[PDB]
Design a protein around this ligand. Structure first.
Ligand SMILES: CCCCCCCCCCCCCCCCCC(=O)OC[C@H](COP(=O)([O-])OCC(O)COP(=O)([O-])OC[C@@H](COC(=O)CCCCCCCCCCCCCCCCC)OC(=O)CCCCCCCCCCCCCCCCC)OC(=O)CCCCCCCCCCCCCCCCC
Ligand SMILES: CCCCCCCC/C=C/CCCCCCCCC(=O)O[C@H](COC(=O)CCCCCCC/C=C/CCCCCCCC)CO[C@@H]1O[C@H](CO)[C@H](O)[C@H](O[C@@H]2O[C@H](CO)[C@@H](O)[C@H](O)[C@H]2O)[C@H]1O
Ligand code: BCL
Ligand code: BCL
Ligand SMILES: CC[C@H]1c2cc3[nH]c4c(c3C)C(=O)[C@H](C(=O)OC)c4c3nc(cc4[nH]c(cc(n2)[C@@H]1C)c(C(C)=O)c4C)[C@@H](C)[C@@H]3CCC(=O)OC/C=C(\C)CCC[C@H](C)CCC[C@H](C)CCCC(C)C
Ligand SMILES: CC[C@H]1c2cc3[nH]c4c(c3C)C(=O)[C@H](C(=O)OC)c4c3nc(cc4[nH]c(cc(n2)[C@@H]1C)c(C(C)=O)c4C)[C@@H](C)[C@@H]3CCC(=O)OC/C=C(\C)CCC[C@H](C)CCC[C@H](C)CCCC(C)C
Ligand SMILES: COC1=C(OC)C(=O)C(C/C=C(\C)CC/C=C(\C)CC/C=C(\C)CC/C=C(\C)CC/C=C(\C)CC/C=C(\C)CC/C=C(\C)CC/C=C(\C)CC/C=C(\C)CCC=C(C)C)=C(C)C1=O
Ligand SMILES: CCCCCCCCCCCCCCCCCC(=O)OC[C@H](COP(=O)([O-])OCC[N+](C)(C)C)OC(=O)CCCCCCCCCCCCCCCCC
Ligand SMILES: COC(C)(C)C/C=C/C(C)=C/C=C/C(C)=C/C=C/C(C)=C/C=C\C=C(C)\C=C\C=C(/C)CC/C=C(\C)CCC=C(C)C
Ligand SMILES: CCCCCCCCCCCC[N+](C)(C)[O-]
Ligand SMILES: CCCCCCCCCCCC[N+](C)(C)[O-]
Ligand SMILES: CCCCCCCCCCCC[N+](C)(C)[O-]
Ligand SMILES: [Fe+3]
Lengths: 302, 240, 281
């Protein structure tokens, strides 16, 4: 029988959408890319255009220098052998300097100086990309929620690779660039601090992650169930409430006794998501700097 | 110690947040009312927040919420019981009267505009140069209702220009007029479009748009409302 | 009390069981048949949990824990105070959840909307049942299930994980985790995007979905769109749950050694298995 709106039945296309101008410098906008019919079954078919100013270029050259630096080490660990490289891909690892070196930049390339260089390029990449999330919003007249949310992610990333090591007194506390190595680090970090299940901020972090999945499932499901009334046109439902927004609200009111608004749900969503990395970064930053063992900490309720 | 303080603080912040979030979500529908329209005695422990004001593009003015609430329309329903909490019975034809799952909101009787101030939704024929890019073109197919009777034929797709997606099929009835059907309520099959929500006799009662080539938020609501309402109210003529 | 717009939606109809008998509300909450069933199952479950806490000797909510029957009982029943209660509470929980979903269906029918929400919810339920029913049954004892206590379940999660070394190496768990992380990324982006348009710079007019598309295209070269992003959240969320269930359904059943060693299938492929150099030669 009936149709569910997970995939489109019919695509339509017209001239490529170059976008709103507002205060964007159009010189820095590429041109449209291909249209992907595959993508179109699910979302939009139009690829591009993208905006590449100075920050963008910097961000992305730096991002590649990070990736190429890690990759150059991978080949070296492979003794330049293409077969070994693919075989051992998930085992290679770019490790930070040893404790010996503390926080200094003294360490030889093969003993973690290369990790410092990779880390330098990544730091430029991410912060400049951050600067980009803010500016591309500024140029369009939009609020800066995106930059503020991305900052929550950054916080966790900074805590792991930069702030915590600094406070701990050595780069060897940081995370190695490798697939398996980074999971071993993670496991070993929990063991070494008494199991992070006893870290109350870890427990929150989990609550919000799981919560993020429930909320997006609820929200997405909800919007699809009222998309036969135009529900996905969220910004106009905010400006002039229609029956989509009302049936949404009422589904939930009747189900769990309270509900949201078409705008407010997006606030629940931004905060549910950002509290994951927000609580997480704190839990981590406290670990070893202030608390050597969360079980023991927990035994004194604090 | 610092961790105690950090964690204690965080619960405090988190209660503040839940309060901001809960109150923000009372910018519509509040104050709570009794079944006759008057304000309810108990509104709960959260107050209404200080109003905020959305400036709307294209001289459409502002929206300020919270503010005076009201249906701005009649509601053909009546109580079926002597206390709060029971269903309200349609006093007429709930499809024609726009109640129940056939409900509509008195939204503004203008069209959604795009970022350029142009009508967001147009029939494909007036949208240069839109066209079906994949899937089976429904234009030309007969349209079958849940009674398994042919109710018309598809004469165009109405499309959302900026987002480039099909929003409605325009269908033509025995009498030569058309109606819009929401895209999300039809199955395009190889040799027909099937519409489970409506039996063939109810296509004439689809609210009709005042201009052949635009559609307003008010009208989209009546159309989408009427069609969905058929799920419940046309079940005596569906069928399988 | 009703929201200002609610009355017109409060009509008869939509029930799956018992016609008009239970067709009513209590304050905001719809009831229905499945609201009655949900209360019965939940109330019973809670009573028996309280009963279990008497038998355990504590009212502290952070100490209350209901364990399933020890492994010696296999899939048979067990005396109440040595696992039988956990078994009954589990039937109660399953009743309550499934009833919750069915009640959601009734609500959908009355409101004339799609069924996506309960269908989604059904994923959470199947994940619950993977842990307490499907996996224990495939493994031969109720005692492989998790206990019902705030901290004891965490204790089970660690023991269960470390029985297989570092559980990170379960490849199905890796995919799940990626979806969980990705979903939260998308939720952050979606909420921020809509809020950045609805709440532009001071003084300015609301932005439009064209602005949202434009912001994303300028940022990363692609916009999935407003239907797209809701489809995506759903997919990401449920795929995370689907692969969670799967990461556990296979664990202790088709794979029961250390997850880390699974990966040797790749390292040992004939064409490079013996080549010296690298990490594994
Ligand atoms: C420390 C750890 C370090 C971590 C660093 C990473 C931080 C990442 C933060 C992520 C924020 C995402 C939210 C984005 C958002 O909603 O608004 C955008 C908002 C601005 O939006 P915009 O685009 O500029 O404006 C256009 C629209 O008009 C704007 O439209 P709008 O209406 O959406 O914006 C208004 C917005 C404005 O938002 C704010 O300004 C945040 C104010 C916080 C106070 C916050 C961080 C929380 C830290 C956790 C603390 C626990 C530590 C332990 O309102 C809110 O959503 C916030 C309300 C919720 C807070 C209530 C809790 C108070 C506790 C009191 C307890 C009560 C007693 C109970 C007993 O973002 C910010 O204001 C943050 C920038 C800070 C400037 C630098 C100051 C440095 C000192
Ligand atoms: C996480 C985030 C959580 C967000 C919580 C925010 C709650 C905001 C609701 C307030 C706004 C709101 O308008 O909704 C409320 C109704 O909801 C509930 O009753 C109950 C709502 C259910 C609340 C669920 C809480 C349970 C715990 C969950 C664990 C999660 C832990 C996180 C910490 C308003 O709430 C009004 O005031 C009362 C609230 O204390 C009362 O519930 C009343 O309701 C009915 O009057 C009827 C007729 O007269 C009566 O016959 C009936 O029995 C009553 O229920 C409402 O009009
Ligand atoms: C054995 C392992 C330990 C454990 C050890 C740890 C450690 C260590 C940590 C966590 C952390 C977390 N744990 Mg744990 N954790 C355990 C068991 C669990 C269990 C469970 C048992 O079911 C769950 C559900 C979790 C869940 C979680 C998450 C809530 C949390 C990370 C949030 C997040 O979004 O990270 C992912 C998000 C980020 C890392 C942010 C990244 C942002 C940057 C800017 C992105 C840069 C990308 C780069 C530029 C590449 C670009 C490529 C592009 C394609 C262009 N843990 C056990 C006890 N866990 C983290 C945390 O916060 O702990 C408090 C953390 O450090
Ligand atoms: C030492 C621990 C091991 C480990 C061992 C395990 C074990 C063991 C398990 C997981 C599972 C998971 N692991 Mg692990 N895992 C580890 C480290 C991690 C890390 C990390 C950062 O290192 C992350 C991000 C994760 C992430 C995950 C998730 C993929 C998954 C949990 C989500 C889930 O299944 O929800 C699914 C959702 C549910 C089950 C909830 C269903 C809820 C029901 C339907 C309703 C509840 C109603 C309620 C009672 C209502 C109350 C009344 C009021 C109204 C509120 N693990 C380490 C390496 N991991 C679990 C998994 O996949 O389970 C299938 C699992 O069993
Ligand atoms: C709130 C917490 C959640 C979160 C939020 C979040 N993340 C965010 C944001 C937000 C709000 C952004 O705004 C920002 C973003 O732009 O998303 C679209 C971002 C972001 N989140 C990202 C990753 C990320 N987020 C993660 C997690 C999370 N993000 C949390 C769950 C994770 C996890 C879970 O580990 C990852 C891996 C990025 C997609 C983006 C930040 C991008 C960045 O900093 O770029 C620098 C690097 C490069 C520019 C290049 C990298 C090198 C490539 C691997 C090479 C491949 C090809 C190359 C790019 C093509 C070029 C070809 C040339 C020849 C032309
Ligand atoms: C499938 C994707 C995600 C998801 C989706 C999802 N959850 C959903 C929905 C959807 C679509 C709803 O429609 C439904 C809802 O109404 O939300 C408000 C819901 C819901 N998800 C909930 C919880 C929940 N979801 C979780 C996860 C997820 N939900 C997934 C990540 C988790 C995790 C991650 O741990 C929890 C705890 C509830 C708030 C709600 C279901 C409420 C419900 O079923 O009510 C009826 C039952 C009772 C009122 C109580 C029954 C009591 C039992 C009889 C006794 C208790 C037994 C229990 C086993 C004890 C366990 C205790 C210990 C583990 C501590
Ligand atoms: C855009 O649209 C949307 C809305 O609207 C515009 C919405 O509101 C929502 C809903 C989302 C929110 C309001 C955000 C907040 C939600 C979360 C953070 C998810 C978590 C939810 C909870 C913690 C609430 C849990 C509470 C429950 C389940 C209520 C339990 C209370 C009882 C009294 C249970 C007992 C039995 C009952 C109710 C059956 C009835 C029977 C008798 C009374 C007998 C979404 C998703 C949405 O997308
Ligand atoms: C973090 C995510 C990073 C993605 C960055 C993609 C960089 C690709 C740059 C290619 C380029 O500049 O060529 C432009 C050229 C066109 O140039 P042109 O024709 O406009 O040139 C005119 C130049 N002026 C105006 C100065 C005269 O080709 C393209 O259009 C290809 C663009 C497609 C980009 C698609 C990437 C989408 C995938 C991301 C998904 C989610 C990520 C997370
Ligand atoms: C095919 O071969 C080519 C040559 C094409 C390239 C192939 C490359 C390959 C295969 C690359 C693979 C890369 C991988 C697997 C990378 C994995 C990275 C992971 C998992 C990273 C995880 C965590 C990283 C964190 C937490 C990093 C945090 C970093 C910071 C906070 C930056 C800190 C900056 C520092 C210390 C430098 C400070 C320096 C100055 C000068 C102030
Ligand atoms: C990010 C997801 C990428 C899109 C992949 C989905 C392609 C599936 C196409 C479904 C076909 C639908 N059809 C032909 C019946 O209409
Ligand atoms: C958007 C806000 C939603 C709030 C969700 C709060 C869930 C709290 C769950 C308990 C946390 C665990 N612990 C150990 C820190 O107590
Ligand atoms: C909320 C974050 C608070 C961080 C507190 C920082 C204290 C600095 C002392 C760290 C001691 C670690 N070490 C190894 C140097 O002894
Ligand atoms: Fe949304």
């Amino acid at each position: 029988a009936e149709y569910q709106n997970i995939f489109s039945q019919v695509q339509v296309r017209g001239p490529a959408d170059l976008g709103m101008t507002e205060d964007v410098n159009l010189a820095n906008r590429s041109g449209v890319g291909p249209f992907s019919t595959l993508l179109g079954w699910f979302g939009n078919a139009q690829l591009g255009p993208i905006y590449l100013g100075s920050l963008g270029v910097l961000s992305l050259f730096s991002g590649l220098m990070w990736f190429f630096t890690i990759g150059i080490w991978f080949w070296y660990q492979a003794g330049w052998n293409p077969a070994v490289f693919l075989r051992d891909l998930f085992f290679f690892s770019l490790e930070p300097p040893a404790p010996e070196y503390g926080l200094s930049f003294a360490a030889p390339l093969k003993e973690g100086g290369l990790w410092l260089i990779a880390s330098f390029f990544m730091f430029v990449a991410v912060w400049s990309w951050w600067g980009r999330t803010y500016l591309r919003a500024q140029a369009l007249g939009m609020g800066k929620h995106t930059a503020w949310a991305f900052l929550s992610a950054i916080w966790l990333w900074m805590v792991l690779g930069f702030i915590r090591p600094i406070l701990m007194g050595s780069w060897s506390e940081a995370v190695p660039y490798g697939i398996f190595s980074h999971l071993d680090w993670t496991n070993n970090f929990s063991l070494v601090h008494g199991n992070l299940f006893y870290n109350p901020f870890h427990g929150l972090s989990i609550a919000f992650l799981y919560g993020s999945a429930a909320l997006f499932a609820m929200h997405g499901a909800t919007i699809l169930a009222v998309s036969r009334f135009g529900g996905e046109r969220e910004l106009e439902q905010i400006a002039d409430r229609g029956t989509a927004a009302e049936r949404a609200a009422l589904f939930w009111r009747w189900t769990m006794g309270f509900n949201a608004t078409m705008e407010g749900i997006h606030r629940w969503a931004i905060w549910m998501a950002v509290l994951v990395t927000l609580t997480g970064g704190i839990g981590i930053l406290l670990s070893g700097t202030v608390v050597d063992n969360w079980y023991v900490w927990g035994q004194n309720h604090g | 110690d610092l961790a105690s303080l950090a964690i204690y603080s965080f619960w405090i912040f988190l209660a503040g947040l839940i309060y901001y979030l809960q109150t923000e979500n009372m910018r519509e529908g509040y104050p709570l009312e009794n079944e006759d329209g008057t304000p309810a005695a108990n509104q709960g422990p959260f107050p209404l927040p200080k109003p905020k004001t959305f400036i709307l593009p294209h001289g459409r003015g502002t929206l300020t919420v919270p503010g005076p609430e009201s249906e701005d329309r009649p509601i053909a329903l009546a109580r079926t019981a002597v206390s709060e909490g029971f269903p309200h019975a349609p006093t007429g034809d709930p499809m024609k009267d726009g109640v129940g799952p056939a409900s509509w909101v008195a939204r503004r009787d203008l069209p959604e505009l795009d970022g350029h101030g142009h009508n967001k939704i147009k029939p494909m024929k007036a949208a240069a140069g839109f066209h079906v890019s994949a899937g089976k073109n429904p234009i030309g197919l007969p349209v079958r209702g849940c009674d398994l009777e042919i109710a018309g034929k598809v004469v165009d797709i109405w499309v959302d220009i900026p987002e480039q997606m099909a929003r409605f099929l325009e269908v033509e009835l025995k009498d030569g007029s058309t109606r819009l059907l929401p895209m999300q309520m039809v199955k395009v099959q190889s040799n027909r479009v099937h519409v489970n929500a409506l039996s063939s006799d109810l296509f004439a009662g689809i609210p009709t748009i005042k201009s052949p080539t635009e559609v307003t938020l008010l009208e989209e609501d009546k159309i989408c409302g009427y069609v969905a309402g058929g799920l419940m109210y046309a079940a005596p003529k569906r069928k399988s | 009390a009703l929201l200002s717009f609610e009355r017109k939606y409060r009509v008869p109809g939509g029930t799956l069981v018992g016609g008009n008998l239970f067709d009513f509300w209590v304050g905001p909450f719809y009831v229905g048949f499945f609201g009655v069933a949900t209360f019965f199952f939940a109330a019973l479950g809670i009573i028996l949990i309280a009963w279990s806490a008497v038998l355990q000797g504590t009212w502290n909510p952070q100490l209350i824990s209901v364990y399933p029957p020890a492994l010696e009982y296999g899939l048979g029943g067990a005396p109440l105070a040595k696992g039988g209660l956990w078994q009954i509470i589990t039937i109660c929980a399953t009743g309550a959840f499934v009833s919750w979903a069915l009640r959601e269906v009734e609500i959908c029918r009355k409101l004339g909307i799609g069924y996506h929400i309960p269908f989604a919810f059904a994923f959470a339920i199947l994940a619950y049942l993977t842990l307490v029913l499907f996996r224990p049954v495939m493994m031969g004892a109720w005692g492989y299930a998790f206990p019902y206590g705030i901290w004891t379940h965490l204790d089970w999660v660690s023991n269960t994980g470390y029985t297989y070394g570092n559980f990170h190496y379960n490849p199905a768990h890796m995919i799940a985790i990626s979806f969980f992380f990705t979903n939260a990324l998308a939720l952050a982006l979606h909420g921020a995007l809509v809020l950045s348009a609805a709440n532009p710079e001071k003084g300015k007019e609301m932005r439009t979905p064209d602005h949202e598309d434009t912001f994303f295209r300028d940022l990363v070269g692609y916009s999935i769109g407003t239907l797209g992003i809701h489809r995506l959240g759903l997919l990401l969320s449920l795929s995370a749950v689907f692969f969670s269930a799967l990461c556990m359904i296979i664990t202790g059943t088709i794979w029961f050694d250390q997850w880390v060693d699974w990966w040797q299938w790749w390292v040992k492929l004939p064409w490079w298995a013996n080549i010296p150099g690298g990490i594994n030669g």
